[PDB]
């Protein structure tokens, strides 16, 4: 049975106007800006951008990859697919 989201979990994350995007739940570094309540820091593969999202926009990657894990014209998307499959836990800073 599922647990709550934790840092390191792999997802597709949904933002308005964008396709479901390969991403991970990030940690928050000591001294770094914390997300709003009930939101998680999402790191988007390929673009390497961070946004704050709640669980309604987070789809576990294993369950969802068949549907959302296909190449997309959008900037950074195919690089992101490579990252989440090949080195999802690396530093991309």
Curated annotation (Swiss-Prot):
Q: In which tissues is it expressed?
A: Widely expressed. High expression is found in heart, skeletal muscle, ovary and testis. Overexpression is frequently observed in hepatocellular carcinoma samples.
Q: Where are the transmembrane segments?
A: none
Superkingdom assignment? Eukaryota
Subcellular location field: Nucleus; Cytoplasm
User: Mutating residue 21 to A leads to what result?
Assistant: Loss of interaction with histone H3K36me2
Stretches assigned to the PWWP domain: 7-64
Q: Which proteins does it associate with, and in what oligomeric form?
A: Interacts with HDGF. Interacts with trimethylated 'Lys-36' of histone H3 (H3K36me3). Interacts with trimethylated 'Lys-79' of histone H3 (H3K79me3), but has higher affinity for H3K36me3. Interacts with IWS1. Interacts with H2AX, POGZ, RBBP8 and CBX1. Interacts with histones H3K9me3, H3K27me3 and H3K36me2. Interacts with DPF3a (isoform 2 of DPF3/BAF45C). Interacts with SMARCA4/BRG1/BAF190A, SMARCC1/BAF155 and SMARCD1/BAF60A in a DPF3a-dependent manner.
Q: Which family does it belong to?
A: Belongs to the HDGF family.
Describe its function.
Acts as an epigenetic regulator of myogenesis in cooperation with DPF3a (isoform 2 of DPF3/BAF45C). Associates with the BAF complex via its interaction with DPF3a and HDGFL2-DPF3a activate myogenic genes by increasing chromatin accessibility through recruitment of SMARCA4/BRG1/BAF190A (ATPase subunit of the BAF complex) to myogenic gene promoters. Promotes the repair of DNA double-strand breaks (DSBs) through the homologous recombination pathway by facilitating the recruitment of the DNA endonuclease RBBP8 to the DSBs.
Q: Under what name is this protein listed? A: Hepatoma-derived growth factor-related protein 2
**What species is this protein from?**
Homo sapiens (Human)
In the record, what lineage is assigned to the organism producing the protein? Eukaryota, Metazoa, Chordata, Craniata, Vertebrata
**Complete-protein stretch covered:** 1 to 93 of 671
